[PDB]
Design a binder for these strands. Structure first.
Ligand SMILES: [Mg+2]
Ligand SMILES: [Mg+2]
Ligand SMILES: [Mg+2]
Ligand SMILES: [Mg+2]
Ligand SMILES: [Mg+2]
Ligand SMILES: [Mg+2]
Ligand SMILES: [Mg+2]
Ligand SMILES: [Mg+2]
Ligand SMILES: [Mg+2]
Ligand SMILES: [Mg+2]
Ligand SMILES: [Mg+2]
Ligand SMILES: [Mg+2]
Ligand SMILES: [Mg+2]
Ligand SMILES: [Mg+2]
Ligand SMILES: [Mg+2]
Ligand SMILES: [Mg+2]
Ligand SMILES: [Mg+2]
Ligand SMILES: [Mg+2]
Ligand SMILES: [Mg+2]
Ligand SMILES: [Mg+2]
Ligand SMILES: [Mg+2]
Ligand SMILES: [Mg+2]
Ligand SMILES: [Mg+2]
Ligand SMILES: [Mg+2]
Ligand SMILES: [Mg+2]
Ligand SMILES: [Mg+2]
Ligand SMILES: [Mg+2]
Ligand SMILES: [Zn+2]
Lengths: 50, 146, 88, 52, 81
RNA sequence: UAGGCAAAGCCGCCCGGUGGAUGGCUCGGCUCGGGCGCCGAAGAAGGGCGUGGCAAGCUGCGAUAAGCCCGGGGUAGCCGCA
RNA sequence: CCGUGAGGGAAAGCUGAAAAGAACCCCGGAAGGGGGGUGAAAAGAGCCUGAAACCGGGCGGCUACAGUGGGGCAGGCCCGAA
RNA sequence: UAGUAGCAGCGAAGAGGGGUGAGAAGCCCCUCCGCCGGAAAGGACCAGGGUUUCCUGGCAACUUCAAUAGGCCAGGAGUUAG
RNA sequence: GGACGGGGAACGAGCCCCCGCGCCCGUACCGAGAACCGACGCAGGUGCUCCUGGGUGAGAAGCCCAAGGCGGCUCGGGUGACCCCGGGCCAGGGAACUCGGCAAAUUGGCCCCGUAACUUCGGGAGAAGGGGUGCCUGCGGUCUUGGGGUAUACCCCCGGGAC
C-alpha cells in the first residue's frame, strides 16, 4: 500500500534484511554444510503475514 | 540502460516516436546519464519522429459539399437530428422579442399585443414571416412591418 | 567492398502462397524466395540476403496478400553469399 | 461462484493483524482483542487446557 | 545519535551541488535533535533538515548547511571520504 | 534340409547409471530412581526489533548490544554453532 | 511452512589418520572431459557401505509357419576355477 | 504408458537488414507489416503485495519452446513536505 | 464568522513594512490476461474504481485512425488426407426433420402513409400493412453567432454554425 503505518513498515524492513542466503565464506567455513537460510523467501511465493 | 526511455523524457515525446540512428549503436553501450543522451541528441544521432495528425483534407472537401445540400438525404439519417424542444425555444424568443419591441415602440397597442402574444404561444404562427404577414394583412399596426 | 562474381535476373513465381494458410502468406513468401535462390545458385538458404525493397514489396499489402510474382536481381559475392533485390 | 471466483475477494481485506503482546497474526481489529493470547479483552494470557 | 555518513553517488552529488551532508541516525531522532547534534559535533550552522526512513528501517537525514560552511570540506575534515 | 545369418522382441549373468536399502556408528530420544523447587511494579515470563569487519539462520547479548567491571579458579592461548 | 482464525506442522545424520580438498598439461562457451597427481583405499566434497525396482552397454541362448507361464523326461548351444 | 497428451480455440503477427555474442527467428538499433485507442491494451490511483523499483554483471536453477532477455540470480543503490 | 452584553488597561489594530517558528508518520514500484486473491508468470475474481482526441453515427454503439502504447493473452516450421471445433455458400422443394422449428434463417435504422379485436379507457401499438432511402448540379427556407449599416427587435451587407 502507499499509506503505511510505521509499525508495519518496520516489520517489512526486518523481513527485507533477513531475506538472503548465507555468504559464500560461510559455505567455505562450514565445508558446504551451511548453504541455505530458512529466512530465504521470494516475494511472489512465500507471503509475509505482515 | 534503455536509451529510448531517457531520450523520450528529454525530447518530451512518446517512446513510440524516439528514433536512434543505427550509426550510434557503438555509443549506446556507453550511455550512463541523461547528459550523455543530451550529447547524442545534439549530434543528431537521436531525434523525435513527427507525430501524425489525421489529415482533414477529405473532411474539408466533404464539409463544403454538405453545406450545399449533399449527402444528407433520407438514406443517410439514422436517428433524430432536429431538437424539437430547442426549436420551440427559438421560435418563442424570435416571435416574442419582435412583438415586445413593437409594443415598446408604441406601434402595437397592449390589447392587440396580448392577442398576438397568446396566438404565438398557441402555435398559431409558423414562423416570423407568417407573423409579419398576419400583422400586415389585418392592419394591426399603423405602418406595415418590414 | 565485397566484389560481385555473378549477376542474374529471375522471375520468381509465388503462386504457392495462394495454397497455404492466409495468416502466414507474406512470411511464407520470404521462405519461397530463399529456397528458390539457394536452388538456382547452389547455396544454403541461410546464405541468401534479401534486400529492403524486396522485403517491402512482399509486405506492401500486409500478411495476407503478397504479390503473385516478383522480378528480382541476384548477385553472388566473392565470399559465397548471395544478395537478392527487387528489380527496379 | 463460491470457489475460485469468490477467492478473488480475499485480496484486499482483513480480520486480524499482528498482536503487540504475543506477536501472532491474530489481533481481531473489529472485536479489538487477540484471538490467540486475549490481549485487549483479558489481562491474563489466554490458554486453554484442551489445547496441547 | 549519528551512526555513520552516507557517501553514495547520490549523497556526494548533493554535497557538491546543494551543500548537504547525508547521515544515518537513530530512528527516533527528530529534526530538532539532528540539527542540534550536527551543530555541536562539527561547529557548523544547519539551514534545514529533511529526514526519511529507509525501507531497511534506518533513518536518513539530508542536512543542509548554512551559507558559510562547506559540506564537502566537512566530509574531508572528518576523513570519511 | 538345416549352418554362415542378423528385424522388432524375450530370458539369464557381468559392468555401468539411477536409487538410497542393508550393515556398522551415535554429542539424540524414552523409561525408571534420587534431588531441588517458586519468579514479578527494584517492571517478570513471553513477544518484536536490533546487535558480528566480511554475518542469512540458530545461540548469546541490548544503542556499553556473541558483549563492560570486580574477585576467585585456570595459564597460553583466544575471537560461539562454524 | 499451512489456515482469516481458533489451530496445524514436515523433510533433513556419516570425506579422510591427516586436506594430504586434486598441482601441472590438452580440449570445452561453461557445467565439465582426458592425461597426470594425493591416499592404505577416491572415500572427490553431489564424499562410508552402496541392495532391489528401473534404464544403458556387453556376453550366452532364442528370434519373422507358428499361441506364451510352471513341472517331469530327452536333447541342442553356452558356462562348469574355488 | 511415451518421446505420447498438451504447449490451438476466448477476433494482434510477424518480416528484412545491421550489431552483440561461443552460440541469435526470438536480446539491441532502423525499416516494413499489423493490434488497442470511452481500452483484456492509453492516463491516474485505493486496498493488498513488499523491494517486485533503479544501476552493473550473469545464466546452474526459474519462464509450457529459445535466450546473450527477465518481475529470475549476484553485487550495489534508491522513497527528502508548515 | 457575527452580534449582543459584562469587566480591565492607556495605549494601539483585520491596514502597510519587517522578523521568527512550524514536530511526528507515509512518500520506491505494481496497481493486474505475469507484482493483489484464487497451490501457477491461472481466459476467473478484485477495479473499468476514476479519466479519455478525430471521422462516420442517435450514440461513452460498432468500424477506421491519433496522443500514447503493444506484437509477452510468452512454442516455431512444413503439409494441405480423414475426422473434430469455429465460420461462408448451396439448384428444386420448404418443417416432409424432430419430443419440440432445437439450431439456422427471415425482419432490422430513419422519414411518410396507415394500424384491428379487445380494454381496467391508461392501453393494445413499432399492432398489422404499404411506400421512400446513393451520388451529382442548381435553387430555396427556418434559425443561430459575431461585425458593419441611423440601427439594441424587424430590414440591408459581410464571415462562421445548425437543421
Ligand atoms: Mg499471490
Ligand atoms: Mg454515405
Ligand atoms: Mg415535448
Ligand atoms: Mg460455502
Ligand atoms: Mg470485517
Ligand atoms: Mg517526511
Ligand atoms: Mg535384434
Ligand atoms: Mg525478553
Ligand atoms: Mg558411497
Ligand atoms: Mg570346479
Ligand atoms: Mg497434439
Ligand atoms: Mg479489432
Ligand atoms: Mg507470438
Ligand atoms: Mg485498428
Ligand atoms: Mg467506441
Ligand atoms: Mg489501464
Ligand atoms: Mg526491472
Ligand atoms: Mg538489468
Ligand atoms: Mg531477487
Ligand atoms: Mg511515486
Ligand atoms: Mg500467462
Ligand atoms: Mg502513436
Ligand atoms: Mg503448430
Ligand atoms: Mg437451397
Ligand atoms: Mg412432422
Ligand atoms: Mg418423421
Ligand atoms: Mg432459436
Ligand atoms: Zn496476542
Amino acid at each position: 500500500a502507499r499509506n503505511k503505518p510505521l509499525g508495519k513498515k518496520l516489520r517489512l524492513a526486518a523481513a527485507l534484511n533477513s531475506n538472503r542466503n548465507p555468504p559464500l565464506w560461510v559455505i567455505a567455513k562450514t565445508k558446504r554444510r551451511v548453504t541455505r537460510s530458512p529466512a530465504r523467501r521470494h516475494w511472489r511465493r512465500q507471503k509475509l503475514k505482515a | 540502460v534503455d536509451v529510448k526511455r531517457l531520450a523520450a523524457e528529454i525530447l518530451g515525446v512518446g517512446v513510440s516516436r524516439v528514433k536512434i540512428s543505427p550509426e550510434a549503436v557503438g555509443r549506446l553501450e556507453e550511455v550512463v546519464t541523461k547528459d550523455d543522451v543530451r550529447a547524442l541528441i545534439d549530434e543528431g544521432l537521436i531525434w523525435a519522429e513527427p507525430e501524425k495528425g489525421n489529415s482533414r483534407g477529405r473532411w474539408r472537401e466533404l464539409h463544403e459539399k454538405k453545406k450545399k445540400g449533399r449527402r444528407r438525404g433520407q438514406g443517410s439519417r439514422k436517428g433524430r437530428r432536429l431538437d424539437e424542444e430547442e426549436a420551440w425555444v427559438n421560435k418563442m424568443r424570435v416571435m416574442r422579442r419582435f412583438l415586445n419591441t413593437l409594443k415598446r415602440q408604441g406601434k402595437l397597442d397592449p390589447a392587440t399585443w396580448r392577442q398576438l402574444y397568446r396566438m404565438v404561444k398557441g402555435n398559431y404562427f409558423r414562423d416570423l414571416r407568417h407573423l409579419k404577414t398576419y400583422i400586415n394583412e389585418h392592419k394591426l399596426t399603423k405602418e406595415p412591418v418590414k | 567492398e565485397k566484389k560481385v562474381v555473378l549477376t542474374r535476373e529471375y522471375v520468381i513465381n509465388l503462386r504457392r502462397t495462394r495454397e497455404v494458410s492466409r495468416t502466414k502468406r507474406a512470411k511464407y513468401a520470404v521462405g519461397l524466395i530463399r529456397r528458390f535462390v539457394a536452388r538456382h545458385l547452389k547455396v544454403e538458404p541461410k546464405a541468401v540476403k534479401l534486400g529492403q525493397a524486396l522485403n517491402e514489396a512482399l509486405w506492401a499489402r500486409s500478411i495476407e496478400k503478397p504479390p503473385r510474382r516478383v522480378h528480382v536481381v541476384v548477385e553472388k559475392l566473392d565470399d559465397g553469399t548471395v544478395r537478392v533485390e527487387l528489380k527496379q | 461462484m463460491k470457489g475460485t471466483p469468490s477467492m478473488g475477494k480475499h485480496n484486499k481485506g482483513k480480520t486480524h493483524i499482528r498482536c503487540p503482546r504475543c506477536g501472532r497474526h491474530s489481533y481481531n481489529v473489529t472485536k479489538k482483542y487477540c484471538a490467540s493470547c486475549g490481549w485487549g479483552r483479558s489481562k491474563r494470557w489466554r490458554r486453554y487446557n484442551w489445547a496441547k | 545519535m549519528i551512526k555513520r555518513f552516507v557517501i553514495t553517488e547520490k549523497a556526494l552529488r548533493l554535497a557538491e551541488r546543494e551543500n548537504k551532508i547525508t547521515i544515518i541516525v537513530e530512528r527516533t531522532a527528530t529534526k530538532k535533535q539532528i540539527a542540534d547534534e550536527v551543530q555541536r559535533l562539527y561547529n557548523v550552522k544547519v539551514e534545514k533538515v529533511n529526514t526519511l526512513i529507509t525501507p531497511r528501517g534506518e533513518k536518513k537525514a539530508y542536512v543542509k548547511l548554512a551559507e558559510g560552511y562547506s559540506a564537502m570540506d566537512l566530509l574531508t575534515k572528518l576523513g570519511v571520504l
